[PDB]
Amino acid sequence: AYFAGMRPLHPIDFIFLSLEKRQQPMHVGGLFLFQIPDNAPDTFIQDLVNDIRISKSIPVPPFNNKLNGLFWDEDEEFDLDHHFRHIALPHPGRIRELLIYISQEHSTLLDRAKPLWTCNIIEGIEGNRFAMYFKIHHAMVDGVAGMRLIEKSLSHDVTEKSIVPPWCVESFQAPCSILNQRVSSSRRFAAQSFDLDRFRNIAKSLNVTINDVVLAVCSGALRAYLMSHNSLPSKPLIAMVPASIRNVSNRITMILANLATHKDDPLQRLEIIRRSVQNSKQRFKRMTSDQILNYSAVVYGPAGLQAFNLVISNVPGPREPLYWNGAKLDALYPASIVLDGQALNITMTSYLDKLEVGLIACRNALPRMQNLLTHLEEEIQLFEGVIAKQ
Amino acid sequence: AYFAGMRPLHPIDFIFLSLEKRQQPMHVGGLFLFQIPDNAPDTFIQDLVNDIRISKSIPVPPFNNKLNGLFWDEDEEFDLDHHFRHIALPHPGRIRELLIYISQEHSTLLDRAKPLWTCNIIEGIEGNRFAMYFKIHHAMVDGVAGMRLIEKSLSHDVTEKSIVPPWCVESFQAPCSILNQRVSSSRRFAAQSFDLDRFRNIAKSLNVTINDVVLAVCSGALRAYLMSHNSLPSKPLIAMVPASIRNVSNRITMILANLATHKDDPLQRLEIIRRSVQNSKQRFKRMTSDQILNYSAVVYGPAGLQAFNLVISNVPGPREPLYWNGAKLDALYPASIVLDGQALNITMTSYLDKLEVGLIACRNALPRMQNLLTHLEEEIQLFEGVIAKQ
Ligand SMILES: CCCCCCCCCCCCCC(=O)O
Numbered sequence: 001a002y003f004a005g006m007r008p009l010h011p012i013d014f015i016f017l018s019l020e021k022r023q024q025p026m027h028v029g030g031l032f033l034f035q036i037p038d039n040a041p042d043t044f045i046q047d048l049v050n051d052i053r054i055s056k057s058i059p060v061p062p063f064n065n066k067l068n069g070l071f072w073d074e075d076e077e078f079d080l081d082h083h084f085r086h087i088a089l090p091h092p093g094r095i096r097e098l099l100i101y102i103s104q105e106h107s108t109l110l111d112r113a114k115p116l117w118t119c120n121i122i123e124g125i126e127g128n129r130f131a132m133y134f135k136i137h138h139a140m141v142d143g144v145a146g147m148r149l150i151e152k153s154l155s156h157d158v159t160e161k162s163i164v165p166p167w168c169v170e171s172f173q174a175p176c177s178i179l180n181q182r183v184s185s186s187r188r189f190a191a192q193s194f195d196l197d198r199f200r201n202i203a204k205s206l207n208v209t210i211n212d213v214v215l216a217v218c219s220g221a222l223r224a225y226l227m228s229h230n231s232l233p234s235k236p237l238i239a240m241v242p243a244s245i246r247n248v249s250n251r252i253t254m255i256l257a258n259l260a261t262h263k264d265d266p267l268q269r270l271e272i273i274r275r276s277v278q279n280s281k282q283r284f285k286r287m288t289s290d291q292i293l294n295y296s297a298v299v300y301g302p303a304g305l306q307a308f309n310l311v312i313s314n315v316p317g318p319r320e321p322l323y324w325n326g327a328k329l330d331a332l333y334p335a336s337i338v339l340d341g342q343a344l345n346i347t348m349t350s351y352l353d354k355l356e357v358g359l360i361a362c363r364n365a366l367p368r369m370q371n372l373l374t375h376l377e378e379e380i381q382l383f384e385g386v387i388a389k390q
Numbered sequence: 391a392y393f394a395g396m397r398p399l400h401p402i403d404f405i406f407l408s409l410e411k412r413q414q415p416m417h418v419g420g421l422f423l424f425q426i427p428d429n430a431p432d433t434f435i436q437d438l439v440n441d442i443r444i445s446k447s448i449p450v451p452p453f454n455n456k457l458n459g460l461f462w463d464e465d466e467e468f469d470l471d472h473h474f475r476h477i478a479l480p481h482p483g484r485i486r487e488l489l490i491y492i493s494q495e496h497s498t499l500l501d502r503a504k505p506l507w508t509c510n511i512i513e514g515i516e517g518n519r520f521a522m523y524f525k526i527h528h529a530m531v532d533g534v535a536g537m538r539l540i541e542k543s544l545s546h547d548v549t550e551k552s553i554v555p556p557w558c559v560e561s562f563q564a565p566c567s568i569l570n571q572r573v574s575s576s577r578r579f580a581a582q583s584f585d586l587d588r589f590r591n592i593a594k595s596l597n598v599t600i601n602d603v604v605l606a607v608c609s610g611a612l613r614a615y616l617m618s619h620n621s622l623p624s625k626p627l628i629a630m631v632p633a634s635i636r637n638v639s640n641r642i643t644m645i646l647a648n649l650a651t652h653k654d655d656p657l658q659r660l661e662i663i664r665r666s667v668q669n670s671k672q673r674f675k676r677m678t679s680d681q682i683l684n685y686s687a688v689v690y691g692p693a694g695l696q697a698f699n700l701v702i703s704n705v706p707g708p709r710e711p712l713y714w715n716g717a718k719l720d721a722l723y724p725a726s727i728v729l730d731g732q733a734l735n736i737t738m739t740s741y742l743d744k745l746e747v748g749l750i751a752c753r754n755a756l757p758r759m760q761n762l763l764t765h766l767e768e769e770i771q772l773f774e775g776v777i778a779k780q
């Protein structure tokens with residue numbers, strides 16, 4: 001064995017630790033929005049956190065794993081107050097201020113002396129909700145593995161009562177642009193839910209896929225945002241994009257595609273994007289460790305002359321609702337990684353027939369990045385408008 | 391493909407690049423001693439180097455490979471005077487001063503902007519010899535892969551004349567000790583050839599393996615050296631050692647073993663070592679990439695509470711002589727890697743029924759480390775003495 005019980009790091013794990021620097025933390029995160037149960041006492045949160053604070057249960061893997069050289073070792077002294085925070089948003093708890101708080105928290109490095117995760121419970125969200133923000137290093141999980149952890153730790157049964165804390169359960173065509181700039185550590189997170197049936201209706205009317213429509217909505221929104229800052233490149237943006245929107249224990253194949261942001265017509269943009277996705281020869285399967293390794297090298301350590309301007313990621317979420325001690329998971333937003341030369345990341349999760357959009361950027365490279373949420377909505381409306389006339 | 395022709399780094403490659411720091415370069419080296427041909431003109435070296443300087447031939451892989459992000463790319467502009475040096479040792483060219491020169495050269499980092507190798511030709515060595523010192527990053531080759539490059543680039547035929555430069559051809563039981571100390575970048579290299587038949591005769595007389603005898607010779611020598619500096623630990627040194635001395639395209643399995651340096655009798659030391667090598671349960675095969683990966687993690691990124699005090703490596707060399715433009719390869723010495731917590735490395739190569747010993751150390755952790763060559767000889771003589779009486 002290896003030091004009696006330890007496990008060597010996987011090469012994938014080691015990539016994300018070696019590439020982490022002050023200016024580019026290599027953790028991912030999930031913003032969970034929970035609806036307080038209809039029949040819950042006013043002390044529902046206080047009691048849930050109190051059960052956590054007094055619990056004698058020990059974290060189960062991977063939450064009890066910590067680094068020891070090039071090996072995963074077991075944490076023998078769980079330090080709750082290192083990993084856990086319970087705070088409240090001041091009245092009236094608007095989503096604006098929640099996202100400010102998450103932007104700040106997503107900026108800070110994880111301490112490598114302890115298991116590489118933290119958990120925030122934020123009470124007082126408008127609309128009778130509370131939030132959990134779970135930060136976890138990419139050396140431990142990517143989005144798909146994170147989703148499996150979510151499904152193991154939460155319940156599909158609204159009646160089941162939680163008895164332990166969640167962590168104890170069971171070739172270079174891309175132009176220069178302001179997106180491609182050295183980054184700071186300070187982040188801006190902008191998140192919003194969209195009804196997936198709007199994209200489904202557009203796809204059916206124009207005889208394309210939902211993935212085609214989503215990518216065209218992103219393209220038009222990026223074109224509008226860049227134009228508003230007089231920063232639209234002459235050549236179109238190139239992006240690493242999914243081949244599909246949902247694809248069986250599977251990570252979706254990723255494709256190098258032309259986003260056609262230099263065209264001024266939405267149908268023209270959609271047409272170029274659809275063809276590019278269909279016909280691109282730079283296709284990166286993510287079914288085997290080696291395939292995932294090679295994809296990770298392309299994306300996080302690309303060779304240079306750049307190859308692409310941004311990554312648009314898709315992390316499938318569950319189709320059936322989840323619950324925490326009876327509280328319904330109302331929304332789930334992904335927060336991914338920015339790094340030098342990639343100051344904007346777009347990641348999306350499908351959950352309950354919603355498209356959960358998580359935008360993460362370097363605060364100083366992309367000012368007012370949150371405007372992209374408005375540009376996205378306006379682009380959906382544009383496609384809906386042209387179909388309404390047709 | 392990956393950027394049209396490039397190749398992703400192997401995880402093994404990436405370990406040796408990521409762990410390199412100022413104080414611990416991660417290159418290996420070979421010191422080649424050549425005998426000038428009996429019928430050679432006095433301008434043999436001048437002409438060989440001149441043929442190199444004027445050659446229009448291009449390096450072949452791996453010598454034309456260079457880093458580009460997390461990928462191997464092709465070097466499109468070979469810069470001879472970056473990679474190549476021709477110097478002379480001042481008269482009378484003793485081996486003492488050759489090893490001083492190699493100690494200094496083995497201390498310096500390789501520039502990552504170019505292919506990760508350099509070649510030194512040193513003329514004027516005593517005894518009608520010249521030396522080649524070839525430095526190459528472990529991200530490109532380990533010892534066994536290096537030996538295969540040597541056999542491809544040199545000739546087995548004394549009559550064959552070279553027409554191109556060589557690069558164009560075709561659980562924690564180990565005590566604290568001064569060996570286990572943070573290191574500087576400055577190196578001391580101490581190299582010497584021993585007749586392998588002396589170890590063979592000892593092995594036959596005492597009914598043990600040659601590997602058993604070599605390890606016992608190392609143990610007694612290390613005990614004497616440490617005692618001479620009042621630095622012999624009370625507990626025995628633990629070492630990562632080979633299971634055999636020659637083992638088919640194979641890397642020898644490595645074993646965690648008790649060197650028994652706390653015993654004062656050579657036969658006692660030999661007995662403990664032989665049993666430990668036979669019975670140790672920490673055995674690390676190196677037949678597959680995964681196995682080599684895991685071995686590399688143990689050795690170069692060990693977990694801590696250390697596990698071992700040093701590594702004694704064996705790199706098999708050819709059994710038949712090699713030649714360069716008629717000049718016989720008379721001797722071949724390996725120079726390996728020291729790092730934080732491992733200030734001494736012992737590596738050995740079998741060539742022409744000789745045991746070629748290459749000792750490499752942090753200059754400042756182990757003063758007068760070259761005395762170990764004397765202690766090694768004295769230990770062989772000790773075993774020969776006890777057999778002569780028996
Ligand atoms: C119960 C603990 C679950 C932890 C889930 C953390 C969030 C999942 C990652 C979302 C972003 C992934 C980005 C990506 O890999 O493309």
Ligand SMILES: CCCCCCCCCCCCCC(=O)O
Pocket residue numbers: 418419420524525526532533534536537539540543556703704705724725726727737
């Ligand atoms: C023709 C170029 C050949 C380059 C050979 C360089 C020397 C081989 C490495 C010797 C030390 C190896 C240490 C080890 O891996 O255990």
